[PDB]
Amino acid sequence: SANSLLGSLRELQVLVLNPPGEVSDALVLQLIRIGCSVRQCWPPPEAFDVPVDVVFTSIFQNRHHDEIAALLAAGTPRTTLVALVEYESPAVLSQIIELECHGVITQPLDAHRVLPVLVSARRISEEMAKLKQKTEQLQDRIAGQARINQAKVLLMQRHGWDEREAHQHLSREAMKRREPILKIAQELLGNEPS
Amino acid sequence: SANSLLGSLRELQVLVLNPPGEVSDALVLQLIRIGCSVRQCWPPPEAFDVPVDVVFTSIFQNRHHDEIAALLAAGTPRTTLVALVEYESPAVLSQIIELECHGVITQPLDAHRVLPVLVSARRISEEMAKLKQKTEQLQDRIAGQARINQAKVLLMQRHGWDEREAHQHLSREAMKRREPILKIAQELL
Amino acid sequence: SANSLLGSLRELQVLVLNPPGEVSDALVLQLIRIGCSVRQCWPPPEAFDVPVDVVFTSIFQNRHHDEIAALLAAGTPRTTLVALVEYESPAVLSQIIELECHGVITQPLDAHRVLPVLVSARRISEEMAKLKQKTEQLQDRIAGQARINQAKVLLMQRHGWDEREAHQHLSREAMKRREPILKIAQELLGNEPS
Amino acid sequence: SANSLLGSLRELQVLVLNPPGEVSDALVLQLIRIGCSVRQCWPPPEAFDVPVDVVFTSIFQNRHHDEIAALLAAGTPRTTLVALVEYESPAVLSQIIELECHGVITQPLDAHRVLPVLVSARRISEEMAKLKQKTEQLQDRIAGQARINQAKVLLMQRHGWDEREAHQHLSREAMKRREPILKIAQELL
């Protein structure tokens, strides 16, 4: 919701992943005026040790590129990403595309750019993440039905059972073992197969 | 794809849906320097007329908001949306959220802010459209797989055939009647 | 080899999975005359607690069917299986087909049937198992190259790297971690994918 | 498949490659009761003449062994092989092993021993032929996959295309020149 998105900003945990300096100070102070919980962080760590909702990062061409790209790829699925951009040139815009930013702030930044990009980027990252998840849920379901299907067919052949028997066995085995019916299929299976 | 995205900016058809004036002017001039096909329109129409890939608009507290909203609600979902924003207060921001922009440019606008926002917003809208397309494909696929599997069990059990035999038969009839395996399967069911 | 097959018989561990009685006695005593290490076993266990090379089993239609079919499906890939057959009828021959026997002895058995079927069934199970294994090795290789291929493409996109860079990274990461290069891909990967 | 295997026994073409006499006679009579098409031949020929699905032979210490061996070495691999055996001693058994029988019947033969051995041996030879066929398919597949992947990297890197784009291009040209994706890929390489 517009009101639930606007009302949740003060609970967001924000990280400013940028070398300490004027850009970083202003950015952190505006986020503190908005009311977000904020922290700056330089050199790029390997992993974040504390939960993070939104990351603000600069775009590097040296060794910090691969560090930032690896760290951010490790993050949680609803991590909002905003890029601090200083160039509109191909190598720089390609990196923003590759990082999958949800919003951009062009430099030099000032206080006025912050909130509109933050809210905006946050509805985008929330929508995208729900869409992605649904895709993943469908993929998972497709693969899982395939595996259960091939374990049933495996049981039919092995035992001379029809489908009902095969299905009955899997369920009974799954039900009384406290393991999903897909677990039994996988434990049964191992055709080194599909 | 970052490369193809950048390489296709000059074929984008961009509409500046905003009142005539300095803001529209400066925005249209920077979209022509970037190289996009750019038109400007005002008052908001009811349907586009010509295909539009990206719309830039402002946030109005009046009837153009609803017009613009309806205009893009009915429009092609791959139309990227960028809002020019001058206030950070809750009713204005709620308007941005309800329009579901793919990117924003806070005012006052200047040329440096345009290209980075147009590209990041375009990636965003295209990635959304792709996930929705994958969702439909996967929904259809799960359903298809089920009927191919229930039809296979049907043949297996009807004829005393193994899975492989049922699969060979489906494929054979399918590819002899120039139709999808799924059609054969649904015919059987 | 003919001579290596014939010379290895005395090291085979044979199980007679059949109710105790005359059939079982004669069968065990002939296997002891051949010189195999032999044991009889009834009711069908859930798993064999000791290594087994060759199983001799009878063909049941009651509850012992599903027990024997489950136990034998659990066995090791070079387990030779010989069926003791009393009927030539469809339900009985279908079960022998479903169990994947390597040889059959028609009842009533006598000492003369044993060695020729044992040797014969054993060259068959050795050939089949090598053929199966090769199939599995190819399947494994296909899937593994696919996964490495999709992790490289994942790295290309993420980092803006070409294929050489992507390949270099995987190898370096795999090499210095003491984990196959396919392990890195799988740990990297997780598209919930192919 | 146990069901289809049993149901197709009456179409099998069985050859009793053994000297005329009581043994051949009794074996041919039991294969006709089972319902197979059955012929008897003796002395072993050099090539079959007519398609043969299953051969029953005995173990000879003389030149028919080599003749029979060569006869089946050159023959269709799906030809099931069953040996009639009367000795359990090492030279006779070595002969069985070297011929690579799919089943044996120890003598004296009687009708009860035939059908169970014919079926188990037929399953065996068919399963062997299938694993060999899968092995070739998989060898071809691994090779194919590689060239589709090296061609894709080639397009990716040539044009600044992502994997998906490279895949769409291969598929499109492929399915516009009515040829395998692999041919397009190898043309590129």
Curated annotation (Swiss-Prot), chains A, C:
Domain ANTAR intervals:
128-189
InterPro entries referenced in this protein's UniProt entry, alphabetically = AmiR_N, ANTAR, CheY-like_superfamily, Sig_transdc_resp-reg_antiterm, WH-like_DNA-bd_sf
Spell out the SUPFAM superfamilies in the cross-references: CheY-like (SSF52172)
Keywords in UniProt for this one? Transcription, Transcription antitermination, Transcription regulation
User: Which SMART domains does the entry link to?
Assistant: ANTAR
Superkingdom field:
Bacteria
Q: Kindly list the biological process annotations in GO that this record carries.
A: carbon utilization; cellular catabolic process; regulation of amide catabolic process; transcription antitermination
UniProt-recorded Gene Ontology molecular function terms? RNA binding
The answer on whether this UniProt entry bears the keyword Ribonucleoprotein reads no
Does the keyword field hold Transcription regulation? yes
User: How does the annotation summarize its subunit structure?
Assistant: Forms a complex with AmiC.
Function comment: Positive controlling element of AmiE, the gene for aliphatic amidase. Acts as a transcriptional antitermination factor. It is thought to allow RNA polymerase read through a rho-independent transcription terminator between the AmiE promoter and gene.
Spell out the protein name for this chain. Answer: Aliphatic amidase regulator
Organism (species)? Pseudomonas aeruginosa (strain ATCC 15692 / DSM 22644 / CIP 104116 / JCM 14847 / LMG 12228 / 1C / PRS 101 / PAO1)
The major lineage groups are:
Bacteria, Pseudomonadati, Pseudomonadota, Gammaproteobacteria, Pseudomonadales
